[PDB]
Design an enzyme around this catalytic site. Sequence first.
Site, PDB file in Angstrom:
ATOM      1  N   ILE A 135      30.236  69.960  18.896  1.00 24.98           N
ATOM      2  CA  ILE A 135      30.762  70.723  17.754  1.00 24.98           C
ATOM      3  C   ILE A 135      29.717  70.733  16.639  1.00 24.98           C
ATOM      4  O   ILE A 135      29.331  69.676  16.093  1.00 24.98           O
ATOM      5  CB  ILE A 135      32.159  70.175  17.246  1.00 24.98           C
ATOM      6  CG1 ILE A 135      33.158  70.079  18.408  1.00 24.98           C
ATOM      7  CG2 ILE A 135      32.710  71.008  16.073  1.00 24.98           C
ATOM      8  CD1 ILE A 135      34.352  69.210  18.156  1.00 24.98           C
ATOM      9  N   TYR A 136      29.229  71.933  16.323  1.00 26.72           N
ATOM     10  CA  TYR A 136      28.228  72.064  15.289  1.00 26.72           C
ATOM     11  C   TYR A 136      28.973  72.343  14.019  1.00 26.72           C
ATOM     12  O   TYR A 136      29.939  73.104  14.018  1.00 26.72           O
ATOM     13  CB  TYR A 136      27.225  73.190  15.611  1.00 26.72           C
ATOM     14  CG  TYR A 136      26.116  72.746  16.522  1.00 26.72           C
ATOM     15  CD1 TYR A 136      26.355  72.485  17.881  1.00 26.72           C
ATOM     16  CD2 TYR A 136      24.823  72.565  16.028  1.00 26.72           C
ATOM     17  CE1 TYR A 136      25.333  72.061  18.718  1.00 26.72           C
ATOM     18  CE2 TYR A 136      23.803  72.157  16.844  1.00 26.72           C
ATOM     19  CZ  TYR A 136      24.054  71.905  18.185  1.00 26.72           C
ATOM     20  OH  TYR A 136      23.010  71.494  18.964  1.00 26.72           O
ATOM     21  N   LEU A 137      28.536  71.703  12.941  1.00 27.59           N
ATOM     22  CA  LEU A 137      29.275  71.743  11.691  1.00 27.59           C
ATOM     23  C   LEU A 137      28.323  72.145  10.596  1.00 27.59           C
ATOM     24  O   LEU A 137      27.135  71.801  10.631  1.00 27.59           O
ATOM     25  CB  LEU A 137      29.881  70.378  11.371  1.00 27.59           C
ATOM     26  CG  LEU A 137      30.977  69.690  12.189  1.00 27.59           C
ATOM     27  CD1 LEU A 137      31.359  68.378  11.538  1.00 27.59           C
ATOM     28  CD2 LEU A 137      32.230  70.513  12.333  1.00 27.59           C
TER      29      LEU A 137
END
Lengths: 175, 178
Positions: free
Chosen positions: A40-42
């Site tokens: 999950i890129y945030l």
Amino acid sequence: FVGKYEVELKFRVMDLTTLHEQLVAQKATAFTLNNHEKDIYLDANGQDLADQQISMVLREMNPSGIRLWIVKGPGAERCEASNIEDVSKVQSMLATLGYHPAFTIEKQRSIYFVGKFHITVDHLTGLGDFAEIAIMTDDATELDKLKAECRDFANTFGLQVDQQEPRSYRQLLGF
Amino acid sequence: SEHFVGKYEVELKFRVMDLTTLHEQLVAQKATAFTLNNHEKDIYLDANGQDLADQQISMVLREMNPSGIRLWIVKGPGAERCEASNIEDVSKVQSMLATLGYHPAFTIEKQRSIYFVGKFHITVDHLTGLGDFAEIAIMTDDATELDKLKAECRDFANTFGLQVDQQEPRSYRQLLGF
């Protein structure tokens, strides 16, 4: 994992039979095998970190159950991670701070060690089979020397400049 | 040492000058002494001119010794919102947070003891400037039950001799002016 800095070379894999023959021959030890991995890129406000050449990832490795919060950057040779207990929890904590899922990347991943070298064997659907060769250091002065060693080691592995992929996974996907 | 956590923390804080009823109640209910008399160091992190504080958010790296409890904490915005995570390496998470723009703003030290009676967390604190405090808290993943958990905390507090008379609703940072 143990080193702020690292050099990494990433390569397209045309033939996994020969790769796994090098891994036996090099007497690599298997860390994790064929894990499903979800990254999950945030980011804040569309692109606040992207713009400083930082990526922040919440990573889960199944079935190993490794859970990591990773800050990559600024740039290619900086990366630090922490083992976390609960991905959903750290996600909410970072959301409160203003970081929100920007996009996700999934992959199949095995990790092997040959002394100080990590070998990562990756399979993505939209792309193909990759290997990543990396050494880390906490010594900023040694980083330039690690470049030559990482190159020499990869060549030994039969993975040469002709099969090199210098684009990140997030670049290869336009993210 | 690991601590197990939630999303909201409903908490009542009191100034105390004797702990007789509180000690007697812990004993009578056979409270769990999670850790006693720990030195606790809270590093408050913030960005720019206090961007977090300006959102009623506190962000803390907490260490307790000798228990070795190590926590990353986000408090707020405001009142009952609190989330926390056990972390293995304070200097690592601190370094990662710095790459994000967060840097130490100040430190608060305390002596702290932590007890459990069922879902109730009983905390007994001494701070150099401030004095002695006791907090009764309950955590919950249920935003809709906050006021009800306040009444539960109040009832419990009163059975422990902690009277509305003594209530200190200001946070430690607020009492110190930070």
